[PDB]
């Protein structure tokens, strides 16, 4: 068998606001007792970079350690689609062995950002539930969140990003809340974030003010 | 072994009256040198063998892969029966293993809603009509849109998603042209699931002043 390598993104949020901090995360699992000593190389785009923080080789309950390399990261770097490859060496496997990774290949596209009302049939029911459709964003990567009067809903739910037929890719977001508080008139609204938006934010609002 | 793979029927396939619901074992990383793979099907560990094994196939990087296909009675899946797939072959180390069968749990009902493009997504030349199924338990659904009884082509369906109530939901965008919306042709959301009166519904939706 032997020692194998995951690499992981960083999650999009980071990678989009303007103080957080994006971190590429390469990690061994599996790694023996008899020769536990494991060593990282970093390249960013071909060329070896020295500012990744290694971390204690974290001993697991079967027999093996686990060791993680976290390379912190430059937002403009990522977005820019730099390619971040982790190279693991192990006294105990024949050729080191290399990860890359890197943002999704192809020209950013710009979310479409519509919230829906409920069904006029769902009224009845106690709980109701709040939509917001993205589609059209290129690549699949973003953030969606609610709220109400400046502070968050915490009961929604978004599916992963689908990938279109026009080659883009869409995505929903359910925010569910008593019905009363759609009864009121308090305005919800749906705050998504992604790279080729203007300042990499919108947000959309909804509330029923009809008749007049 | 190497590795091997169950594969569940297609929700489609085991709520429509006369599909013919198949399990799927995939086997692959077999080797050129000595493959000849072995197959040995369990219901609930008892023994039938109305299951016929793919001749098997083809490679891209020198390495075979092979896989065989049981066909399976629609109630004895929705009735929850556990289903084994075993691969029976030498190679490396000893026989493998693999079960599958149904979600288990208490099949819940699709609530369904069709919503209508906004206000906004009207300044387009193709619009979205939304297809809300929420509520619904297990995960196993199917979803299609038509119009004059005639399919709608121009869709795509969300995965379901685990709900916060331990049920799911899933989203279907339906895309059609804004000049289609206007006209006031109806579009049909159509929704099949086991916990459906008569395993299936369908919304209607259209434009109303
Ligand atoms: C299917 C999936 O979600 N992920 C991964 C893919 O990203 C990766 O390159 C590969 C190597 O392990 O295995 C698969
Ligand atoms: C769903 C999940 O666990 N994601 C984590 C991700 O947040 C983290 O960046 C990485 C660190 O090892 O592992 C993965
Ligand atoms: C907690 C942890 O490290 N889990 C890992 C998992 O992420 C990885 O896919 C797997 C491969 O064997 O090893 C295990
Ligand atoms: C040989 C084996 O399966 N080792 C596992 C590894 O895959 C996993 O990452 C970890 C779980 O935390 O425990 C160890
Ligand atoms: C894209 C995708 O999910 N493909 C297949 C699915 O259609 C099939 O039923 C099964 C193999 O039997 O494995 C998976
Ligand atoms: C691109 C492709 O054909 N991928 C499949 C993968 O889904 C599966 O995990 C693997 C099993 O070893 O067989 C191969
Ligand atoms: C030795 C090996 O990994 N062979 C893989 C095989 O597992 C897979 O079915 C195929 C398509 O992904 O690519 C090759
Ligand atoms: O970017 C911040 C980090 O958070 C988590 C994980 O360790 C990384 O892959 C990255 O997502
Ligand atoms: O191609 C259709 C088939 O796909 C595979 C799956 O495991 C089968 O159950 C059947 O649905
Ligand atoms: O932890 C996430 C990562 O490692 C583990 C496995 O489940 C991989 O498939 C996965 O990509
Ligand atoms: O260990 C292989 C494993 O890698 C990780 C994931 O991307 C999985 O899809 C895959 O099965
Ligand atoms: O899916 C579980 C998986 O998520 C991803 C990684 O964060 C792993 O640490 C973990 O094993
Ligand atoms: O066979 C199932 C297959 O699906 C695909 C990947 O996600 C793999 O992890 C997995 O082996
Ligand atoms: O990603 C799709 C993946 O799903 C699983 C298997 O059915 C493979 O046929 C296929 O590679």
Redesign the interface.
Known sequence: GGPSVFLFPPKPKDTLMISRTPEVTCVVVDVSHEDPEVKFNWYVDGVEVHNAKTKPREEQYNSTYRVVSVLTVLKQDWLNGKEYKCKVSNKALPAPIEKTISKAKGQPREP?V??????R??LTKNQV?L?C?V?GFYPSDIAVEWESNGQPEN?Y?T??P????DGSF???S?L?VDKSRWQQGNVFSCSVMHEALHNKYTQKSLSLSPGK
């Open positions: 479409q519509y919230t829906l009302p409920p069904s049939d769902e539930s939509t459709l589609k009961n739910k599916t992963p689908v990938l279109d037929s869409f995505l929903y359910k569910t």
